Structure 1
Amino acid sequence: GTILIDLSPDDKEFQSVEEEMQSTVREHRDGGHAGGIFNRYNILKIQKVCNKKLWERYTHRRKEVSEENHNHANERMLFHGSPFVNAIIHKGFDERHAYIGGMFGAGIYFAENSSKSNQYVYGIGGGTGCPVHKDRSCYICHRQLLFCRVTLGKSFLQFSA
């Protein structure tokens, strides 16, 4: 039930999504090991993901959370990078998309920094890099990130290195 709608670069919605991508790039403490060396991206395409069943599943849970947190879903827009982006856009997030060894336990992880989610596009730690060249810093191969609507509700604050 998923359809993908291309956004024009002239569309304000394309432009605001691109700006969030580009403006949340930072340097990483691995010197680019996982995600590559770069300060900015070449955006090739931005598509809106439209799936009624997945949307309704999201809004149902959002209302439950909201009602448990003084009518506040604490909804954010956050990046997610994964080898399974194609499964996610068709079937939704589930336990198969979790970072079992993540520092905050086995859950599904998102980042404010697009460059942080970029480190996971080819796997944990960048895996072996792109499938074609085995390069975590490949400048040729096309990468994909999701920019996601996320309900945080009441969020446990972990101060961490």
Structure 2
Amino acid sequence: GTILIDLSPDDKEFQSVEEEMQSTVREHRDGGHAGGIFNRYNILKIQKVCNKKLWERYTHRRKEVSEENHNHANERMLFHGSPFVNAIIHKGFDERHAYIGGMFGAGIYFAENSSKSNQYVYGIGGGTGCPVHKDRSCYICHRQLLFCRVTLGKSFLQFSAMAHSPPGHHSVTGRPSVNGLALAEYVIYRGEQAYPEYLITYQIMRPE
């Protein structure tokens, strides 16, 4: 049921999604171990992910959350990196896409920093890196991230350096409490609370 529509680089929508990718790169405390060493990306393609059934599943849950939270879905656009991006865009998010060992429990994790999601493209901790060269910092191989619409609802705030949401909450927010430059990360515990809106194909770029 999924079709992928290419955006033109001239399209304002391409440009605004690219800007969110590039502008939310940061340095990571692993010195690039998981995701590679880079300050920016080479964006190769941005595609809109269109699936009516998955969209309706998302908006149905969004309305339920909204109604439980004074008509406020608390919807964000957030990055998700996973070796399972291809399954996600066809079948939707579900329990198989959860990070069982995540610091906020077994849920599906999203980041404000694109560079954080980039650390997960080849698996937890970058796995063994790219399939072709076994390099977590590969500058040749094409990578993919999702830029997703995510319903947070009432989000449980965790200050810090598939399970259930905390009672009375629809998500968890992981607030950075140490690294002053890090943006927030978020966890949802139901696949229906995220829609994979854009598929971004890119390379990390070797700094000069």
TM bucket, shorter chain? over 0.9
Q: Which whole-Å deviations, capped at 9, do the CAs of 1:83-125 have from their partners, x for residues lacking one?
A: 0000000000000000000000000000000000000000000
What secondary structure sits across from 1:49 in the alignment? strand
What secondary structure sits across from 2:78 in the alignment? strand
Q: Which whole-Å deviations, capped at 9, do the CAs of 1:19-56 have from their partners, x for residues lacking one?
A: 00000000000000000000000000000000000000
Q: Which residue of 1 aligns with 2:183?
A: none
What secondary structure sits across from 2:77 in the alignment? strand
Q: Which whole-Å deviations, capped at 9, do the CAs of 1:105-160 have from their partners, x for residues lacking one?
A: 0000000000000000000000000000000000000000000000000000000x
Return the alpha-carbon distance in structure 1 between the equivalents of residues 9 and 62 of structure 2: 30
Higher strand share: 2
Return the alpha-carbon distance in structure 2 between the equivalents of residues 135 and 93 of structure 1: 27
Higher helix share: 1
Return the alpha-carbon distance in structure 1 between the equivalents of residues 75 and 96 of structure 2: 23
What TM-score do you get using the length of structure 1 for normalisation?
0.99
Equivalent pairs, count: 159
What secondary structure sits across from 1:147 in the alignment? strand
Return the alpha-carbon distance in structure 2 between the equivalents of residues 68 and 46 of structure 1: 34
Q: Which whole-Å deviations, capped at 9, do the CAs of 1:41-87 have from their partners, x for residues lacking one?
A: 00000000000000000000000000000000000000000000000
Calculate the aligned-residue CA RMSD, in Å.
0.1
Q: Which runs of 5+ in 1 are unaligned?
A: none
Post-superposition, which runs of at least 4 consecutive aligned residues in structure 1 deviate over 3 A? none
Return the alpha-carbon distance in structure 1 between the equivalents of residues 10 and 156 of structure 2: 39
What TM-score do you get using the length of structure 2 for normalisation?
0.76
Return the alpha-carbon distance in structure 2 between the equivalents of residues 125 and 70 of structure 1: 38
Matches within 5 A, 1:18-97: 18-97=18-97
Return the alpha-carbon distance in structure 1 between the equivalents of residues 22 and 141 of structure 2: 18
